Amino acid sequence: ETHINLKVSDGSSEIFFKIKKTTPLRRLMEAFAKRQGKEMDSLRFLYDGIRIQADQTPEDLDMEDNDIIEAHREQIGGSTVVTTESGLKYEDLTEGSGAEARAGQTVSVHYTGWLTDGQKFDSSKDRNDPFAFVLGGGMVIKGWDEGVQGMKVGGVRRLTIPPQLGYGARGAGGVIPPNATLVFEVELLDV
Numbered sequence: 001e002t003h004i005n006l007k008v009s010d011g012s013s014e015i016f017f018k019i020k021k022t023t024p025l026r027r028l029m030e031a032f033a034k035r036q037g038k039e040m041d042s043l044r045f046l047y048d049g050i051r052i053q054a055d056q057t058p059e060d061l062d063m064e065d066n067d068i069i070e071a072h073r074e075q076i077g078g079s080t081v082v083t084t085e086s087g088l089k090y091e092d093l094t095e096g097s098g099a100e101a102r103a104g105q106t107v108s109v110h111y112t113g114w115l116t117d118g119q120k121f122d123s124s125k126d127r128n129d130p131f132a133f134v135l136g137g138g139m140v141i142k143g144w145d146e147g148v149q150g151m152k153v154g155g156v157r158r159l160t161i162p163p164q165l166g167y168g169a170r171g172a173g174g175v176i177p178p179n180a181t182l183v184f185e186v187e188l189l190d191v
């Protein structure tokens, strides 16, 4: 076999690639960034825990068919997944430099939401339409009221919301099933 299949995951979704075994991984890395809209985010691609160089081939890295490449935005101070008392998980992919969001403010965000299997169920970016809500008002699922608080303007935060802080046994929108854990990436546009 001269070709190899590889999966790239960023913790939110996944993309599969078929490339020649002797081809540098540069094109695969750029194609993943373009499709996920994370070109300017300076991604790092890891295989077996070691950062991939663009000029390295799957042959160089002794990759086998269906191996997995992990991609992430470069994290100053290391990756940190925070689990709160309620079971909500959040991860500051980009810490914002602006004002901090607090309960009672009308905040504006861009968001994409995925199920845990990587299937996207909604994205405000797909509509070129920022989403606004009153923080802490019970107008969104509980994981959002808890997880968006403390974000700073310009920040990107990934929320992993257990079902009892999301849509629970009911699901939502004819796409989110019962008992679904939800994954959101939220960019705070204004507070």
Ligand SMILES: COCCOc1cc(OCCOC)cc(C(=O)NCCOC(=O)[C@@H]2CCCCN2S(=O)(=O)Cc2ccccc2)c1
Pocket: 111, 113, 121, 122, 123, 131, 139, 140, 141, 144, 172, 173, 174, 175, 176
């Ligand atoms: C009634 O007609 C059947 C369609 O049912 C839909 C459709 C819908 O969006 C359409 C908007 O497009 C123009 C929202 C909803 C819904 O319950 N909103 C409540 C607020 O939402 C939330 O609290 C979370 C967190 C904040 C961002 C949005 N979300 S979400 O998780 O992405 C909401 C969602 C989106 C798609 C599928 C399932 C859920 C129901």
